[PDB]
Amino acid sequence: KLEEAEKAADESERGMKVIESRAQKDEEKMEIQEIQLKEAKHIAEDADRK
Amino acid sequence: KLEEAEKAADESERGMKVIESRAQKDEEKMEIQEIQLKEAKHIAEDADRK
């Protein structure tokens, strides 16, 4: 049961590492896409201002 | 150790679910900011075009 509970922790932790690494990749990509959106929008606003 | 391993199962699994929720929020924000980046770039393209 300790192996099952610890394995549930270890496997859910690996699950977590993959989806936390995914959250990190999605977070970095969303920040990049958000900064690029802010800039593409700021370019659009700058182009609208122009 | 089993109680702590079950608490770790809960924390690594709750972690995995909080991270899955965060990864989903960051994935949706990634997907929302890339779709809206493509739109913000098309607005920049339209803003530059107009």
Author numbering:
A (entry chain Q), B (entry chain P): 112 to 161
List sentences from the manuscript.
Sarcomeres are force-generating and load-bearing devices of muscles. The basis of the mechanism of skeletal muscle action is the cyclical interaction of actin and myosin, converting chemical into kinetic energy, which leads to relative movement between thin and thick filaments and is the primary driver of force generation within the sarcomere. Combining cryo-FIB, cryo-ET, and sub-volume averaging, we present the three-dimensional structure of a mouse psoas sarcomere in the rigor state with a comprehensive description of the organization and interaction of key sarcomeric proteins in molecular detail.
Segmentation of the tomograms and 3D classification of all sub-volumes of the cross-bridges indicated that the two heads from the same myosin molecule, known as double-heads, mostly bind to two neighboring actin subunits. At this resolution, both myosin heads bind to the actin filament in a structurally identical manner with close interactions formed between actin subunits and myosin as well as tropomyosin. Through further classification, we determined a structure of the complete double-head myosin S1 fragment, including the two heavy chains that are bound to actin, two ELCs and two RLCs. Compared with its conformation in the crystal structure, the lever arm is strongly kinked between the ELC and RLC binding regions (residues M801–E810), resulting in a bent conformation. Interestingly, the kink in the upper head is in the opposite direction compared to the one in the lower head, bringing the RLCs of the two heads in close proximity. Notably, the arrangement of the ELC/RLC of the lower head in our model resembles that in the “blocked” head of the off-state myosin while the upper head ELC/RLC is similar to the “free” head. Thus, the binding of myosin to the thin filament shifts tropomyosin from the C-state to the M-state position in the A-band, whereas tropomyosin remains in the C-state in the I-band.
